[PDB]
Design a protein around this ligand. Sequence first.
Ligand SMILES: CC1=CC(=O)CC(C)(C)[C@@]1(O)/C=C/C(C)=C\C(=O)O
Lengths: 538, 538
Amino acid sequence: FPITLKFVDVCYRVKERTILSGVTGMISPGEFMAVLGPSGSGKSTLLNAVAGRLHGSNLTGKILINDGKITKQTLKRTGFVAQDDLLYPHLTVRETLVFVALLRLPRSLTRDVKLRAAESVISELGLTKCENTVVGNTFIRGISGGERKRVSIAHELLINPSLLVLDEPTSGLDATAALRLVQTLAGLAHGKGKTVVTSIHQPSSRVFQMFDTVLLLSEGKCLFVGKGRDAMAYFESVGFSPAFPMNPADFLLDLANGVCQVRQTLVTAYDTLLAITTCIATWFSQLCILLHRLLKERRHESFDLLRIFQVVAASILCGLMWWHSDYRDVHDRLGLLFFISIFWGVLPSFNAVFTFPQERAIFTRERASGMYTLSSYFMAHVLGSLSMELVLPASFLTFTYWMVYLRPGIVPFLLTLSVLLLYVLASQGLGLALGAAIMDAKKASTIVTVTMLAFVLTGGYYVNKVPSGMVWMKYVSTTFYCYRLLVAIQYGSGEEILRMLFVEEEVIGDVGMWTSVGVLFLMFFGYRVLAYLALRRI
Amino acid sequence: FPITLKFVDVCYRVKERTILSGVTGMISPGEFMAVLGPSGSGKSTLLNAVAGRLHGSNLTGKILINDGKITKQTLKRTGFVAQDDLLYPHLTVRETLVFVALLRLPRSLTRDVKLRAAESVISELGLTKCENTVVGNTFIRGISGGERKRVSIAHELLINPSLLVLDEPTSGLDATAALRLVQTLAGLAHGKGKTVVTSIHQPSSRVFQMFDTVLLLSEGKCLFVGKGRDAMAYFESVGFSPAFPMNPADFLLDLANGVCQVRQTLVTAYDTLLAITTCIATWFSQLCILLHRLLKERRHESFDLLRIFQVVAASILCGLMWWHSDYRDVHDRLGLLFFISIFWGVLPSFNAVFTFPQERAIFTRERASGMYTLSSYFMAHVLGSLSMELVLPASFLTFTYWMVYLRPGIVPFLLTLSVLLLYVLASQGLGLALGAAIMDAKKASTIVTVTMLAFVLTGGYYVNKVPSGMVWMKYVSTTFYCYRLLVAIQYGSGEEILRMLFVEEEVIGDVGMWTSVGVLFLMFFGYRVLAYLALRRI
Ligand SMILES: CC1=CC(=O)CC(C)(C)[C@@]1(O)/C=C/C(C)=C\C(=O)O
């Protein structure tokens, strides 16, 4: 319940650099310590010794919680708020925390007690007035910048921690907003008895006064530690004082650099003055939350009105160039089944490469704190993009089948619909597999266009006389199989239009109807087992 | 030479809002006034009465320079630095100002005196240590954030102004950097005798002390105007004083909101206490600078290593699927001239839509201050993208003509090369025309893909039996003419392969060889006169 961080001589290196060189401090419960210092002075590198996320040869020193070397028993009461607010844009403020409660709180609790443990942090972090507004981001009209930091603090206030370690929470806020956000972080130490240690960039006048304890670092030597009242009165005991009306934070940061109307002199004054079946049951609940959580993310990636327009446009071009087409024109119709097969191998695999890059930050953050394990995260993008990446092609083909006059009958329709969707999902798994192998979104959006070019050229339409050494590349192609199958569903084995009439080199093809459905399934599962094995390195 | 801004009762409205409600002040030469206030209190709306860029029914009030109503004779000595540093990323620090000097200083001066009037502002704004480093941006390794504001202040220090009106220059800078940047803005008033009025967001302790005069606005009523020493000593004459060690800017901003341990009380204490051939010669020099200026911008848009890879890839696919192709296979070769014709109508027109959107901020800023006129700006993108958007296609076709075994002979080569480049530039003018009509880069990158889809479908390859009502749309198509011409250059009028053998429906076509070269020229000039008429509204 109480956490007395009692770190001493916290040293640290990096490969040449040294961030911390013997810091020492104590942080008792009910006490609002604030670590101050110049930029690059070693602030964040020491908050990540209170967050316990830096231990090895770099960190040297004994970091203690209640005089005990740190454990994950001691890491269930510590919540480290980082500077990046990683929130999903389309979730309401309440949904954003209702979902994190179910994922974070232990499942032993009921699912109706988890709803109030996530709605009390709303009411006590002052979010009651904006609990039902979209979080948004720069592009989406959302919440204020001061509310987007409270919401990111309610994440770590859901496990009810003891040692709460924020990392520059006020940076980028208003003048009054960054005062209230520290008025609230005082109530967590003065009204709840927590141990809150935060670093602030440039405190205002009222924001420095509300500190109980203060810690100053120049370059990693702990120039001063103690109360906020005893800081400005300590330094003049060596001969330093403001020459003009100052903010006591302003005066103390200047001393951190050595600028007096002195850095090395203020460090030597520290030597002598201030020296079985459930496991498959939790997985299917991590997946049921991760599917309903990021459901509006899979409804903005898919029903963007610049994708509905690029498909309502193709549906009126593709259904006007071929209006009441005739099946006897075997060459006008094999070029329709290759536009349908080009459009839907490029549209899915391209838009599916901006999915893993865009969420590598929210994933690795929320994966390292428990809360899911990449088997339920991967399988919630997979199962969530299947459901949404089939509504545009299913409705393009429903419009481009009765105006184009393709093969009538409910059986040839549902077999063309079935073959499109199985190909829309087999090419989309090419996006997911390249997006995850190359975690860059613009470097991987070019390799999925140089790859759908090698797939469209070798797809069997432009070239009928492929060289003897380039014949294999149509087999690893995904458009070869959707086009072999789209033709065989509208014409067949010839013999019904060879009865009516160049129509045996483009109508009989090379592969069966089942080796074309059995390899558009080995590319469904095969391009997802590679999208996962590529994420097993993050 | 001296500027005594003597504005009085500067009122302002907007449609309901009111930013300023009777401000009054005086700003004499040699005097560093700093206007302070809360966010939205009316700071920037009053700096844009010193920048003279807000006059009409909204602004009401007499704004005076040397007791004279403002003119562009009085607007040649005023330089308004705005918050956005709009610099071209690839220009060196010296080139960025050497180019602005030639465009800004009057051409009566020599071109070697303009070189020193632009290198003295380098030396006296402390840029000598980084004059030969790339400016860069977030993506490009460039200069510091404090040097990127000096460079944007050397722009307005090139016409040698008198009333220099900066707008929040320190916002987003370091702790020490924002001190030096105000140490330098004091030398412009203490070492050069200028009239410098700037608004600062949250001054530090040493940054408030370096103000000569100060102006405080709560919501547009001028709570206080006067020296920096007389501000904290004035308010206690009504009973206000800091209850704890403050920065005097911190204490005064709190009073701006009415927060004392009062807003309306501090305003009433102001009523009674502080109450022919040369014109075508300048144009061809504005164009010679604007071409050498943004030349490295037309070398990053064009030689991006993800465009060299998307064209070195197509050149090895297109030259491996058709390796030693045979001219007797009339259908394998008409599908090669439609890949060449699809690739080069989509690659140029797509990448040419992100040009006018990305520079609508640097253009409108630098156009309103003289310095060019959109006839020389437009004609420097046009003439600058022609030269660079022909190096990739000219070198794709040089590789895909002697491996593919197209029609041998220097005359059929240079006629295919000539027809490609004329089509690469006629489709690129479709990007420029849509990018400028729709100044959004992602909303216009979708209409130039729904348009190159209607152009590729009606290009005469996929459909040979186009409906009776959709036959016109191949004539307004740009791929129809590059494909009609690419075929006629490799086959001709038939008669040489009809001698050797479906090859009269795809080889003779509809349009002549001169109506196909005479409409790929009416789309060069026609898609540029529309890209310009769309920019004549910005
Ligand atoms: C998928 C893709 C990748 C490229 O690099 C070229 C291009 C843009 C043309 C393309 O859309 C390819 C499609 C092609 C060749 C044919 C078509 O569209 O009918």
